[model samples]
Target: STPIQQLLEHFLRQLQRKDPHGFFAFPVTDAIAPGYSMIIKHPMDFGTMKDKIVANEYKSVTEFKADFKLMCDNAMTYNRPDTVYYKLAKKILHAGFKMMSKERLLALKRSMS
Candidate 1:
């Protein structure tokens, strides 16, 4: 399983490299760990987050939210028990999913799993 901190760093790095104009107008903010450098690119602004998803350009925020919930649920394992860590992890996942989708969310889930 991936450590929450490592996962957050990886996600930030990935977002930073994304082409903003061709990707997202707004960046994903690391709510769990607030920092200007931590914003994740969430491009799909073909219209609204949901609209972009409907147009197949990307996934909706809702889908991302659900998936983040799923990640936190899965992360609460006895092998790496840390209530504070998992709590923060859950919050980060929630914020992340808000900028993600069903497919994208599933991909993240798969990668982290």
Candidate 2:
């Protein structure tokens, strides 16, 4: 996970430094919550893509991120820029909406169900 594992470790370390007990209390669980859960959930739902990923384990978080994008993209469609799914789709393909600095993205998300 190259920079991501390092980033996570550093972030968790910082959290650990701030709240030692809490950090250790949920080290493996909370620290790995997203990735671990995603792997389990994806296989049952999107078994084909999940098979591809498992065939070649992630070399970095960005690689895993690509598969994640694939999954979400398959699940949602963005018909308009002023819709939550649109903003969300762009975020999945590009990056976070905050990173996009596109106010329309938030506006779209707000207009959605």
Candidate 3:
């Protein structure tokens, strides 16, 4: 059970590897998109996810997916549907969800249990 942290890190690493452009690597700022903060109330990014993992903030895979989802959702919020960032976020989200599918969840949990 304690080694759940191990599974968490592996998940994060796999998810991050898919993001080669590093767009979701750090928090977005006004420089990149004006009024981003005011629009997106709960900002989520890969860096924050790592911090939360070290801090033991997420107790389950469900929680981890929540943060990842939030991060992608933030991008969609700040950019228009036609914009590159928005489209990219949607693709990133779909790819990430595949990693978090039912089969993958059971496979990881079986190792922990």
Candidate 4:
């Protein structure tokens, strides 16, 4: 499994432990809610995607992220953004960028004079 798969499995395992049926029937309107935010913003979307995710349909983290961003963007376009997911995604992207360009990012911070 890819990094995205690991992350999803990690989170979904938490969900499965909680719900047992692998279904999240609770409302997730509160972005700050403890575990629900880790699931998809749309419960029905989670319903459809979780099986595919567990089955390893996503080929790469990038592939998973494209779908994730689309889902988040879709939700945001319909209404307010899921700030928790937005912030978490930004942090994750930043971490990935830094991981991918440790030297370059550090070099960019060096004095040019």
Worst 10 residues of 3 by lDDT: 1-10
Q: How many Å off is the CA of 71 in candidate 4? A: 1.2
Order the candidates by TM-score, highest first — what do you get? 3, 4, 2, 1
lDDT of 3 by residue, 28-86 (tens): 98888798888999988999998888889898889999998998899988899998779
lDDT string for model 4 (30-78, tens) is 5635555554454433444466687888775455445544444433433
Highest TM-score: give the candidate number.
3
Task: Rank the candidate models, highest lDDT first.
Answer: 3, 4, 1, 2
TM-score of each: 0.26, 0.28, 0.85, 0.38
* Residue pairs in clash, model 1: 23-43, 24-43, 28-39, 28-40, 64-97, 65-97
Report backbone clashes per prediction: 6, 0, 0, 0
Best by lDDT: 3
* lDDT for residue 92 in candidate 1, whole number 0-100: 50
